[PDB]
């Protein structure tokens, strides 16, 4: 459960990404593919090399989903319901993998926003991404 301070912390930190949202989503995906090669097998139709236009475009989509969750943090199951259906039903993403992308999103934010990435904000962002992950793994059937 996200406290009022966690919600403020996540909004404020994410607020500093500005026009870089898509870029940071793309970077987190690249970090995941390189660090955790098992995740690559979900994207056989993409080239995952550096500078990939497909990873760049997907990173904008991932960032847009995370901004949706920030903007609707009190109603996240509803906001991410379609995405939760997609990842579980159609894509069959293994729940372990959400922990891996979540870690790589934290690393990307830490690498770009050092003033924002205080221990308290780190904790809030981890709880936020764990809540997103709980929603995105809630529909297996």
């Amino acid at each position: 459960v996200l406290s009022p301070a966690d919600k403020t912390n996540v909004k404020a930190a994410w607020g500093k990404v500005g026009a870089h949202a898509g870029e940071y989503g793309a970077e987190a995906l690249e970090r995941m593919f390189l660090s955790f090669p098992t995740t690559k097998t979900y994207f056989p139709h993409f080239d995952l090399s550096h500078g990939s236009a497909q990873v760049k475009g997907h990173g904008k989509k991932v960032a847009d989903a995370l901004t949706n969750a920030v903007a609707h943090v009190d109603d996240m199951p509803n906001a991410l319901s379609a995405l939760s259906d997609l990842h579980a039903h159609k894509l069959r993403v293994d729940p372990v993998n959400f922990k891996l992308l979540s870690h790589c999103l934290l690393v990307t934010l830490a690498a770009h926003l050092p003033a924002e990435f205080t221990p308290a904000v780190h904790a809030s962002l981890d709880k936020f991404l764990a809540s997103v992950s709980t929603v995105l793994t809630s529909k297996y059937r």
């Binding site: 955790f36 690393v107 830490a110 690498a111 221990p119 780190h122």
Partner: protein
């Protein structure tokens, strides 16, 4: 665990710039703040009541320096992490009963601290090399459970 020479170069070049008196306390303090059940193991450390209390707790800083010294030893012995961590495995598994998932969590908190401290220099390939390192340390530390 498998690091290529180019990964080893990336890992050790960065590590030479790490402040070894500070980064281990930053990682341990962030473990206690981000994963607060881990505080169960540090009752004698005193004030852990707020993030500021944890991060400025001198016992967290001192204990973190020991933790980082063990990582430094693993870095110096990447091809025998099991031997390197044997007594620490006996301690953390047989004596303290720490669930080994927490070894993974602390390794990943250290990765986040390195990202924070090195910024753009902590490139995706440099991270991938450090993930191999912290995975190998966690696995070696968990050997007494296996």
């Amino acid at each position: 665990v498998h690091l290529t020479p180019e990964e080893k170069s990336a890992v050790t070049a960065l590590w030479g710039k790490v402040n070894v008196d500070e980064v281990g306390g930053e990682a341990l303090g962030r473990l206690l703040v981000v994963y607060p059940w881990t505080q169960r193991f540090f009752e004698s450390f005193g004030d852990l009541s707020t993030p500021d209390a944890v991060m400025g707790n001198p016992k967290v800083k001192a204990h973190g320096k020991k933790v980082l010294g063990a990582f430094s030893d693993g870095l110096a012995h990447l091809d025998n992490l099991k031997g390197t961590f044997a007594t620490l495995s006996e301690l953390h598994c047989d004596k303290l009963h720490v669930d080994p998932e927490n070894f993974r969590l602390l390794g990943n908190v250290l990765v986040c601290v390195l990202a924070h401290h090195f910024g753009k220099e902590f490139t995706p390939p440099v991270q991938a090399a450090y993930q191999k390192v912290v995975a190998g340390v966690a696995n070696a530390l968990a050997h007494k459970y296996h």
